[PDB]
Amino acid sequence: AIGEFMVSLPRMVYPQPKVLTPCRKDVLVVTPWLAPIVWEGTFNIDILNEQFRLQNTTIGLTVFAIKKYVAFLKLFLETAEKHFMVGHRVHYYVFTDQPAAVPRVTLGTGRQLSVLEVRAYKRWQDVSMRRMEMISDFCERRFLSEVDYLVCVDVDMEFRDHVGVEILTPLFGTLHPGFYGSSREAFTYERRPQSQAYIPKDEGDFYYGGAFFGGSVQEVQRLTRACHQAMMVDQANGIEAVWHDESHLNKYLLRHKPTKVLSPEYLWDQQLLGWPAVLRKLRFTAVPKNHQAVRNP
Amino acid sequence: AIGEFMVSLPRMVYPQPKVLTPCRKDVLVVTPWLAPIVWEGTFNIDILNEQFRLQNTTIGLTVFAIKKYVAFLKLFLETAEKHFMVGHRVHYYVFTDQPAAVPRVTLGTGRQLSVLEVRAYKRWQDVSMRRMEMISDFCERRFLSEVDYLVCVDVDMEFRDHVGVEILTPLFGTLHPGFYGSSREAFTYERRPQSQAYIPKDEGDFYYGGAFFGGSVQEVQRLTRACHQAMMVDQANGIEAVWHDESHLNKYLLRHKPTKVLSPEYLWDQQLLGWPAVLRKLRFTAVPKNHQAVRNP
Numbered sequence: 001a002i003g004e005f006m007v008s009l010p011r012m013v014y015p016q017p018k019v020l021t022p023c024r025k026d027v028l029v030v031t032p033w034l035a036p037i038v039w040e041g042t043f044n045i046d047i048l049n050e051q052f053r054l055q056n057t058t059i060g061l062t063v064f065a066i067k068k069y070v071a072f073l074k075l076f077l078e079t080a081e082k083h084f085m086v087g088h089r090v091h092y093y094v095f096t097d098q099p100a101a102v103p104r105v106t107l108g109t110g111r112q113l114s115v116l117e118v119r120a121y122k123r124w125q126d127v128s129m130r131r132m133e134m135i136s137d138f139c140e141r142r143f144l145s146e147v148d149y150l151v152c153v154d155v156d157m158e159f160r161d162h163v164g165v166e167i168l169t170p171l172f173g174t175l176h177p178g179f180y181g182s183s184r185e186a187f188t189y190e191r192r193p194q195s196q197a198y199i200p201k202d203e204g205d206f207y208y209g210g211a212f213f214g215g216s217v218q219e220v221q222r223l224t225r226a227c228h229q230a231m232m233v234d235q236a237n238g239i240e241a242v243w244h245d246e247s248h249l250n251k252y253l254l255r256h257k258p259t260k261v262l263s264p265e266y267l268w269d270q271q272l273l274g275w276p277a278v279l280r281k282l283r284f285t286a287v288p289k290n291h292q293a294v295r296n297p
Numbered sequence: 298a299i300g301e302f303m304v305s306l307p308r309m310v311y312p313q314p315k316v317l318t319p320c321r322k323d324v325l326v327v328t329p330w331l332a333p334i335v336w337e338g339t340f341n342i343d344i345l346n347e348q349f350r351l352q353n354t355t356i357g358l359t360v361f362a363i364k365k366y367v368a369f370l371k372l373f374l375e376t377a378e379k380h381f382m383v384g385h386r387v388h389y390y391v392f393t394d395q396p397a398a399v400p401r402v403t404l405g406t407g408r409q410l411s412v413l414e415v416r417a418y419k420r421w422q423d424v425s426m427r428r429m430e431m432i433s434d435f436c437e438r439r440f441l442s443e444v445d446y447l448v449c450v451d452v453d454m455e456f457r458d459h460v461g462v463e464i465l466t467p468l469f470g471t472l473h474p475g476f477y478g479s480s481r482e483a484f485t486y487e488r489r490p491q492s493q494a495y496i497p498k499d500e501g502d503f504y505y506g507g508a509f510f511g512g513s514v515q516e517v518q519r520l521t522r523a524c525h526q527a528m529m530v531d532q533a534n535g536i537e538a539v540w541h542d543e544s545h546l547n548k549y550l551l552r553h554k555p556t557k558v559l560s561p562e563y564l565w566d567q568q569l570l571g572w573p574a575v576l577r578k579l580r581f582t583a584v585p586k587n588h589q590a591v592r593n594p
């Protein structure tokens with residue numbers, strides 16, 4: 001459940017926080033709207049685990065595995081078992097056009113998997129974009145009754161290190177690995193004024209990755225609903241945003257500030273971008289793929 | 298109101314946050330439980346003002362002016378008018394044993410003051426401690442149906458700089474100005490295990506000042522009820538905590554982590570402590586007083 005009130009912790013022994021020592025001297029750890037930016041070194045996971053366990057927190061994890069992308073599920077789920085929310089209640093939701101192709105994966109106690117059969121769109125752009133509509137629909141159909149928080153990710157990925165309750169908050173986005181160090185004019189926002197996802201060169205906080213966002217079920221429902229509606233308006237106007245659902249996610253989070261922002265520890269591609277010193281851990285990373293081959297028959 | 302969901306902001310022009318530049322290099326700006334620690338340089342007040350105005354936020358401010366402390370009201374209120382939550386709805390609650398002695402203070406638009414008549418205790422310790430009971434009682438009688446957040450402060454103080462919506466959150470405490478750089482072993486927590494306020498030497502995050510705390514009405518009601526109840530247990534057991542209400546406030550916030558922590562900018566004494574480099578602003582500060590003279594006939 002999401003408790004309405006602060007919870008009471010038992011006695012705990014851990015190092016005292018140091019007021020006169022910054023937890024990181026190399027990165028921004030809070031946004032100008034006072035949302036934590038989650039980097040290793042900023043959180044004590046034992047405290048957070050207590051707070052969230054005391055509320056019997058249940059986390060849904062949504063993933064789409066349409067057409068050839070069912071091949072990514074085995075490694076995705078096996079690594080999630082090792083690294084994602086261990087110790088907490090987890091409900092995986094695998095959206096797929098091929099229920100029988102979902103691999104058998106042994107789950108830890110308190111963890112379960114639902115397969116949600118959905119239609120496959122022809123264009124990969126549509127498959128990716130229609131995730132917003134499908135997530136929104138199932139929030140009403142299933143998620144509101146079943147989980148407290150939703151975490152919505154790409155399937156062509158693997159967990160390599162801890163991804164836990166430190167990310168949970170009403171609404172979160174994740175710094176895109178290609179742009180965390182970029183100025184807002186280099187951000188690949190949709191720049192056509194006619195698009196609902198339009199963002200001018202003098203606006204923008206961060207470039208958030210479409211591959212990892214989430215929040216309470218109610219906030220994720222609103223975000224996904226609003227993004228879908230924006231895409232439908234664009235469609236009616238003959239427009240498709242440069243980066244599809246990610247463009248609309250960025251517009252949404254520009255205007256509705258997330259209450260936490262995850263660092264690129266949470267969304268990385270090691271082959272493409274290496275391992276900068278600023279990343280103490282690589283938690284959730286790309287799996288090599290041949291885009292053209294895997295996206296088409 | 299305290300909106301259920303994130304609000305939508307209009308277009309805004311402000312400097313882009315810099316992921317690879319820490320906002321402060323000299324202080325901790327986030328706790329190990331991912332609560333912001335509020336210092337100048339961590340927040341953009343324009344973004345926060347928009348967020349809270351869109352919710353039509355009403356902030357209540359409680360202050361006790363019992364016996365000779367009515368003398369502090371004029372400067373307290375006149376400076377609050379210049380610096381506290383300007384632009385937002387404010388409801389001052391002045392608890393006093395002398396309603397007729399409350400000074401006439403001119404208020405800006407959207408701001409109101411209520412005088413709550415309460416009993417005077419003989420001992421200054423009891424006057425200070427009974428604030429918990431009194432705030433708790435009025436949370437139910439009045440604050441629940443009248444304001445969104447409550448801010449509870451000492452009266453022997455003046456505002457010298459901005460104190461605004463950046464502090465608002467479900468539950469906040471403030472770093473005591475005397476001890477922000479101290480190790481936990483040095484904190485003047487209650488150390489007798491016979492007291493409900495007991496905290497052993499290997500526990501403690503910060504030493505919070507009893508002169509400035511707050512949060513949602515519901516969280517403040519819980520904190521103040523719990524502190525009063527603990528004080529009554531100690532009294533039945535023949536013990537009074539070393540620092541009275543502050544000792545209990547500290548035990549409470551140790552076990553129920555605050556969702557923001559305010560830096561000593563928000564609670565200072567310049568005569569005692571000067572103006573250290575770590576304080577870029579001095580926002581709410583002690584008015585000199587002769588403790589013995591003002592606390593007794």
Ligand SMILES: CCCCCCCCO[C@@H]1O[C@H](CO)[C@H](O)[C@H](O)[C@H]1O[C@@H]1O[C@@H](C)[C@@H](O)[C@@H](O)[C@@H]1O
Nearest residue numbers: 176177178179182186188210243246268269272286
């Ligand atoms: C100034 C920096 C210039 C260099 C930026 C380098 C990374 C670009 O990244 C792409 O960025 C797009 C938005 O602009 C989409 O998010 C796309 O999905 C993403 O590629 C995906 O994520 C990537 C991390 C890779 O895994 C790629 O294979 C994926 O297709």
Ligand SMILES: CCCCCCCCO[C@@H]1O[C@H](CO)[C@H](O)[C@H](O)[C@H]1O[C@@H]1O[C@@H](C)[C@@H](O)[C@@H](O)[C@@H]1O
Nearest residue numbers: 473474475476479485506507540543565566569583
């Ligand atoms: C290692 C540092 C050694 C030096 C510490 C110097 C500040 C001490 O502070 C007192 O601390 C107490 C708890 O231990 C109570 O909070 C007391 O109300 C407070 O004095 C109040 O607040 C102070 C800021 C002053 O305004 C004082 O006049 C007040 O009575």
Ligand SMILES: O=c1ccn([C@@H]2O[C@H](COP(=O)(O)OP(=O)(O)O)[C@@H](O)[C@H]2O)c(=O)[nH]1
Nearest residue numbers: 064065066067069124127128154155156295
């Ligand atoms: O044929 C497809 C194309 C994409 N997707 C889903 O849409 C996500 C985003 O697509 P992709 O990973 O190819 O985008 P990229 O990361 O390269 O931008 C994938 O992770 C899958 O979950 C899918 O299931 N089948």
Ligand SMILES: O=c1ccn([C@@H]2O[C@H](COP(=O)(O)OP(=O)(O)O)[C@@H](O)[C@H]2O)c(=O)[nH]1
Nearest residue numbers: 361362363364366421424425451452453592
């Ligand atoms: O005779 C008194 C003593 C205490 N107080 C209230 O209790 C608060 C805390 O007492 P005080 O400021 O004297 O404590 P200190 O800050 O010195 O520790 C004061 O700000 C007043 O609001 C009061 O109204 N009358």
Ligand SMILES: [Mn+2]
Nearest residue numbers: 154155156211
């Ligand atoms: Mn992907």
Ligand SMILES: [Mn+2]
Nearest residue numbers: 451452453508
């Ligand atoms: Mn005082």
